[PDB]
Amino acid sequence: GLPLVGRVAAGEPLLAQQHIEGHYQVDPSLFKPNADFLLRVSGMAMKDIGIMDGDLLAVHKTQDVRNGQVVVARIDDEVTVKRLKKQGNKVELLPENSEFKPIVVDLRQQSFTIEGLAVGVIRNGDWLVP
Amino acid sequence: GLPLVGRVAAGEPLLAQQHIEGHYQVDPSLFKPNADFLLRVSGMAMKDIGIMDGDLLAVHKTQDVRNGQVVVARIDDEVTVKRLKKQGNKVELLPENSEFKPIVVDLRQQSFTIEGLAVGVIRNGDWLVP
């Protein structure tokens, strides 16, 4: 099934073997565009739209993303899940939690890559229960 | 796969044929206890824990529920998803949203049934997109 990506080693590609924690069969008709992998979410930055710490984000592999969409982004090795808001050579990664602040990126100054598009969420896949 | 239950007709059993909107293959190792069906969530009463309107709740069929757990309950034909807090002949169904109020049930006065245990959530299964 879909590979589950855990915390990503700095600079290391998302689907690097060390990152995969397992594989889970998920009906492809569930999400659109189709989910290509699952990514465990770190933190509550997107809690207001129901994306909680520990959730498994369903991600479609693409870089064809538009403003307003929730994306998986990599900024200087750090991988994050935020709402995209680009404007010229400036990209804003907005949270959905007032305890967090927007992340502003200067395309000229730092390395920025869209890893994928959030197309769903699966809550569970608990690493504590047998 | 797991059957998806849409809005439930008053007094009608959950898995009544008219309620099923489809079936989705979901890896059984994903949830524990195992998910037996999916239930579309109506409203934002559980938004603070990330259960949003339109989410598909993964439900384990059982009545073996304990205080503190999120359950699917039926009170006088109405089916709801809340956190259980029972005390004698009085059952409190608590929300996770300040815009909502706790639902107090008198076991002697009204019909109350535990339909199942919430074991997960799948967000998507959009009825608008082809």
Curated annotation (Swiss-Prot), chains A, B:
Residues at the catalytic site: 45, 82
One cellular-component annotation, GO: protein-DNA complex
Disruption-associated phenotype: Cells are filamented, accumulate DNA double-strand breaks, have viability defects at 10 ng/ml ciprofoxacin. Synthetically lethal in combination with a priB deletion.
Keyword Repressor found: yes
EC assignment: 3.4.21.88
Enzyme class: hydrolase
Effect ascribed to mutating residue 11 to D: In lexA3, resistant to cleavage. Increased sensitivity to hydroxyurea
Tagged with keyword Ribonucleoprotein: no
GO molecular function terms listed in the Swiss-Prot or TrEMBL record: DNA binding; DNA-binding transcription repressor activity; identical protein binding; sequence-specific DNA binding; serine-type endopeptidase activity; transcription cis-regulatory region binding
Record site: Cleavage: 10-11
Family the entry assigns: Belongs to the peptidase S24 family.
Function text: Represses a number of genes involved in the response to DNA damage (SOS response), including recA and lexA. Binds to the 16 bp palindromic sequence 5'-CTGTATATATATACAG-3'. In the presence of single-stranded DNA, RecA interacts with LexA causing an autocatalytic cleavage which disrupts the DNA-binding part of LexA, leading to derepression of the SOS regulon and eventually DNA repair. Implicated in hydroxy radical-mediated cell death induced by hydroxyurea treatment.
Protein name (Swiss-Prot/TrEMBL): LexA repressor
Annotated organism of origin: Escherichia coli (strain K12)
Full-protein interval shown: 75 to 202 of 202
